[PDB]
Symmetry: D2
């Protein structure tokens, strides 16, 4: 009688899809995504690095903003990721096809990216995107260097098994600024306790809060800017209310502890 349900698209708040002009974060580092999704362009003498790309439909916008910054498609050398969900790695496959970029990621992120976010530990097949391959597998603490800028990977599993914080030192008019691009610490709708697909989930989150607290962190950014209290829409004041890494980890742990207590109740 009833047919099987139609496929449902992954739809998001309009602000996550609202294009913005490039916003300078430090001397070499620019936010080039949307008002509510981070995509960081780091420009060096020997090419550019992109950290995250946002949603699948953002590929053209990212290339447009790269061109505004003077980065031709072939000048993009490397793509790094916070984690391989559709709202952060969405356009990676298309960006690889349209640029000279390689992708570097840890093994967990590589296997999730290669299945386009399908068979997610918590989302199943509900939130997917075009698959892409990682060209370089990185280990915890490994340094990736482009044009002399060194990016250090800090694994912080929990939100995904492959969740990664990336740190690098830029300058603000020549003076060092230690940037920490810390991954999400949310657990949206997750089963936290006794999860057969992620048995050590709680232990991983708890260690990840400590990892984030200890990051070198003059300036924190996050894949969802609201998580670190950034306001990309207000330009020069965008960073004014930004959290420290310590405060971001503390807020995330308090939310996590409350969610765990509610799960025990329900």
């Amino acid at each position: 009688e009833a047919p099987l349900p139609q496929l449902r698209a992954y739809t998001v708040d309009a602000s996550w899809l609202q294009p913005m002009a490039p916003l300078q974060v430090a001397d070499h580092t620019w936010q080039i995504g949307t008002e509510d999704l981070t995509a960081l362009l780091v420009q060096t003498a020997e090419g550019a690095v992109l950290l995250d790309g946002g949603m699948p439909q953002m590929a053209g916008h990212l290339l447009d903003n790269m061109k505004l910054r003077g980065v031709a498609p072939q000048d993009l050398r490397l793509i790094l990721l916070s984690h391989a969900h559709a709202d952060h790695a969405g356009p990676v496959a298309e960006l690889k096809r349209r640029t000279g970029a390689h992708v570097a990621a840890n093994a967990e992120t590589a296997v999730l990216l290669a299945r386009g976010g399908s068979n997610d530990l918590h989302f199943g097949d509900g939130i997917t995107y075009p698959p892409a391959s990682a060209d370089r597998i990185i280990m915890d603490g490994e340094v990736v260097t482009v044009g002399g800028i060194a990016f250090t990977a800090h694994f912080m599993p929990g939100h995904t098994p492959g969740s990664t914080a990336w740190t690098w030192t830029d300058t603000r008019d020549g003076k060092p600024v230690r940037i920490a691009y810390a991954d999400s610490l949310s657990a949206p709708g997750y089963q936290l306790k006794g999860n057969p697909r992620y048995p050590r989930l709680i232990e991983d989150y708890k260690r990840s809060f400590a990892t984030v607290r200890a990051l070198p962190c003059d300036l924190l950014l996050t894949p969802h800017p609201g998580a670190s209290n950034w306001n990309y829409a207000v330009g020069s004041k965008a960073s004014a209310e930004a959290l420290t890494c310590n405060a971001y980890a503390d807020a995330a742990e308090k939310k996590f502890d409350a969610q765990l207590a509610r799960e025990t109740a329900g």
Copy 2:
């Protein structure tokens, strides 16, 4: 001002998603998909073969019908495909996870399946599904045998580069019936002439019409039953109006020639 567009789901006619009970095609062969999408179960002494699975959301229905036929999940040994579009290979990844099945397919089908139908030559990223890996690569004319039933692959590129017809001989109360499961010969919205992503498209279709004409073909079935004039909803009369392979290829070539003439006009 305007945000980027939301992602759009691949939605289809309700009849493509309308479950049906198993319909016997020959002694060992059953249609177990929906009223308007073919999924053929061939049952042998040494396990079962599935030819196509339909849409991604059909995985549970297929397993239900397998159980009605006496095929436990671990009894499914092999998945074969007509072509790797979402409406025929949709549930392959999930079926592999939930059964003991391997997938056998040609290289073109394997590479399209492995990217979940993304970066399609004609559809781009508009019609995708969870990626799956082929476990065995097959060549044109290669025979795959399960439980003594021999399935022969006949490449018929055009609708996709990897489009394949599968033939086998079943029985009807012990008497031989040469079954031809011929792939689609449609070109829905395709640019046929001077296509930079498929320069020899017209030559491939034209050869594929000839391939289909020559198939051993007592009984023709097609991924979309309407293409061969099957009527799955009427049970015992389902095959009554079915086309021959010759008539199917002729109708497809006439449609193709008309579409090519219209493309030249527009």
Copy 3:
């Protein structure tokens, strides 16, 4: 003048390639590899599991011993691995082609297996084997069940990033025996300190010694039987001198500490 060097084969001690008849370890568990490489067959009512396969050239021998145990190729349901080096995962690709088996492994093991052991963190391309794909990705502590026998994964990174101990409870004439198949803890020729390809190597080994100490462990086996003092060549006395998990971890840590001190010296 001098040509580039010829490729060099991965050659091993003859005892690693010396076939042996199946040796019973417990009611359902058999050593079916060679005198000096472990390959464990666990036989259940609903099919068999293979833990490791040894060297690439052992595939036929493994299938022979499976047949002696009553396991037809299609009865092999699952392959599990200690780690994805050529002397333990060597024949996995061929076994998958010749049996109905899937492979389950963590993400690190999956990415190393998929490149056939090439670009190894320590061996480069010197020790490789035919690539294979993991069909199921498992997380730390995840339970995989076949025929009612539950196998629990315990990650113990160091020898490879994906190194895994597998535990299960068998019986000895109906009485429970907790088997621990603990991975290698060696670091043959490895740079341990300040390794840019594995920055947290020492921390991972140190945690892995503790993981092995805590395993449920009535009977310890290891990929190289000599590491746990097994003597496969003497049949019924093969397990007589076997180490406990505690003693295996202690011996490995003492060796590791000495090697680290020598590396600091040299």
Copy 4:
């Protein structure tokens, strides 16, 4: 009693491993491989293309010759292949890691490259190399353009299913020269007739001879220079005795016909 055999390395004639300085073929095109294996560097205003790399151990030599030509590792934009055997695609994985290059290849070549030449239709696992992934899948007749130089793919299956001829137009002091890099047409030790792994092998070779005859072909080069009568070791006279595409196809077909007759005899 007897242990299983040791693994055997793929060893080749010394001349295949004999490094040579870059040899100019046309204004933009250089032979940069060894005396007996072709590796063509095409240098454009917008980066370089490499067609084949030879044996796995040639990676460093190729990078050295690129540097002599003024091509830094990051200037290599694209790798194209004749076919994915160890003596032509051997160093592709390492070159991708050490350069900015992507690989473009047809689906058949991509699936063979991704398993490192293992499970070869004729060689089994005897001739393998580190696996690499194709970043772009190309179709027959598709044009790939770098720095304004257009490379056209011409499929010529037989030696491998994915065998490809690549054509482009260079200049000799400004005057057009149509270069044809035609793949191997040998069948070394192959079973040609009734091959269950390649049922249409003879038909594919026969069509491939015709494909090679029709190539735009002012100057023919081949993966093994001896096949087209090149003499890389004599510098300026290297091309003097080179065959036409017509003569290369004719010689290959005569050899093929004789081998087929001998196979029928034996």
